[PDB]
Design a protein around this ligand. Structure first.
Ligand SMILES: C[As](C)(=O)[O-]
Ligand SMILES: [Zn+2]
Ligand SMILES: [Zn+2]
Ligand SMILES: [Zn+2]
Ligand SMILES: [Zn+2]
Lengths: 331, 331
């Protein structure tokens, strides 16, 4: 593909560097940041926080993040462009659809959703000219008809553009298998797909079977381990009860099984969030003060201590995301 | 007190004139018009259609419309301002919440929703400085805890500002009675409330009892009818099988019952819609080519034919809306 679209324009593959492939500047809902910025203190305060957060990730080695905030998660690409410029960190914007499609979206056909995704990749997002460089989709539990529709639209937009697909799953129901079956029915190469939130499960058989088929495995919620918060049923029912080390050890397990080229690692962090309880951002920041720097500051050294060679870690953090993000109709 | 907030700024109540109190420029979902304007052909084409349509209504006597498109219906206050100025027709913008709140909205408390509505009334919508002049809310036949939350927030916003409330109801389920009960539980005078979509039911006992308590009765979907479109299931499901004359006769029925002062008449029209089936705008336009001018060009002469005095009609189309829309504080 030779070049990747970012919120500051196209960049060469060689410029991508250390990449976090599943992040958010702000997790919200369509139109919300514009309608009630004071929910986040102010837009200015959100930008300031995000710029500090990205600058800290940059100092820990990160050069690119993939912001997988979709339309229905309130993606504001102008926000992304501003914080990318100030922090000097590449940001890849997303199209696709998460779990909260509005009535307008829920009424659309597979053809119409394909056109929408293609618009955001080929023409630009809103009136900004910023083009999406990834397609993000989400399913939960048992595949609904609309979920299937979004997955087929995602596959078709990927096939038309070479841009990869990244998914939200909820590993407990092995949602990746359902997603894979739909993607393959559309003729999509598994090498264009990252099955994400895969660190939510300890089922290594499930993960290795997907990697064997050629899928990228997104181990992308490593710091979302709320092991001291049982009094907080909200944090418990959204973060879980396994430690971050246990999650991180899945990375090593997959490396040990021979699948280092299939692994993508990230934090799934953000600097503001409105789509859960008020001040849930404070709860998250309390559990993981490192923010997006958690992967480079904590997880990479942890894997290095466990015997993972430097070259393998560089492969996972630099080579795999570059190969994944580079638009490809092959192979 | 004697001035209403419009998308072009405050205007004296004496300038309001022939008013349609339940209308839309565009029915959509949050952020959608900005993300995929091509769904409507283009933003420019939507503006052209709306300005033309509004101009036709202006020529037929209409001076003001109340656009009760909310945040979740994809209200675009900049669209409203542009079309208001070009058609030279007053437009009152809405705050509140309809039936499609996103995840962020669904997670908010009664206090938070109150603050949101108050922002849009007291400060302005988004970063435009354009203030809302009506609070629009909606519940289903069987009201949820979230619906009740929205109604209480609406009542508290109305009490703090004097701006009135308009509701969407399932009139067939006598929705006004459950809404009125919580409105009154918050101390809100009924004269601040229009129970909308009341022409959906022919239960005159229901309508007259609400009218008798001092509620406004929105007979606001008069041209909506799928008569002669029985092979179109989506048309039938939304527009219904009752004739426009049937709906219009409810206006004369309430007049004859002595409640001409409680009647607000409108079209519930729009010039674009994305929150239903594709091209449904074409279906609506084929049913009512007159658009927002249907009420002056078809309904008013119909009622005259049926013996309704001109004076009664002038009072319904001009005096009632002025009294309703004018901000009223105490009691
Ligand atoms: C916005 As999420 C918690 O599904 O990565
Ligand atoms: Zn996710
Ligand atoms: Zn995420
Ligand atoms: Zn309605
Ligand atoms: Zn309406």
């Amino acid at each position: 593909g030779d070049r990747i679209n970012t919120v500051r324009g196209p960049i060469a593959i060689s410029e991508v560097g250390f990449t976090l492939t599943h992040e958010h500047i702000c997790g919200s809902s369509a139109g919300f940041l514009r309608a009630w910025p004071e929910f986040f203190g102010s837009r200015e305060a959100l930008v300031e926080k995000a710029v500090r957060g990205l600058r800290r990730a940059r100092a820990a080695g990160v050069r690119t993040i993939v912001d997988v905030t979709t339309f229905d998660l309130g993606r504001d690409v102008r926000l992304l462009a501003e914080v990318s410029r100030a922090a000097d960190v590449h940001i890849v914007a997303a199209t696709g659809m998460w779990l909260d499609p509005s009535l307008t979206i829920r009424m659309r056909s597979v053809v119409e959703l394909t056109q929408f995704f293609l618009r955001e990749i080929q023409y630009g997002i809103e009136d900004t000219g910023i083009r999406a460089g990834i397609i993000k989709v989400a399913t939960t539990g048992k595949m609904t008809p609309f979920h299937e529709l979004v997955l087929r639209a995602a596959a078709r937009a990927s096939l038309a553009t070479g841009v990869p697909v990244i998914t939200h799953t909820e590993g407990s129901q092995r949602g990746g298998e359902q997603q894979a079956a739909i993607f393959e029915s559309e003729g999509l190469s598994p090498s264009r797909v990252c099955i994400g939130h895969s660190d939510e499960t300890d089922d290594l058989s499930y993960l290795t079977a997907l990697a064997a088929r050629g899928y990228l495995i997104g181990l992308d919620r490593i710091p979302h381990s709320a092991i001291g918060l049982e009094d907080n049923a909200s944090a418990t029912a959204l973060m879980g009860s396994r430690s971050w080390q246990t999650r991180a050890l899945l990375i090593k397990a997959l490396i040990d099984q021979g699948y280092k080229k299939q692994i993508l690692v990230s934090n799934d962090w953000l600097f503001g969030i409105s789509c859960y309880v008020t001040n849930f951002m404070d709860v998250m920041d309390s559990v993981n003060p490192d923010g997006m720097a958690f992967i480079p500051l904590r997880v990479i050294p942890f894997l290095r201590e466990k015997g993972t060679p430097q070259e393998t870690l560089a492969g996972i953090t630099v080579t795999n995301p570059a190969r994944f993000l580079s638009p490809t109709l092959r192979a």
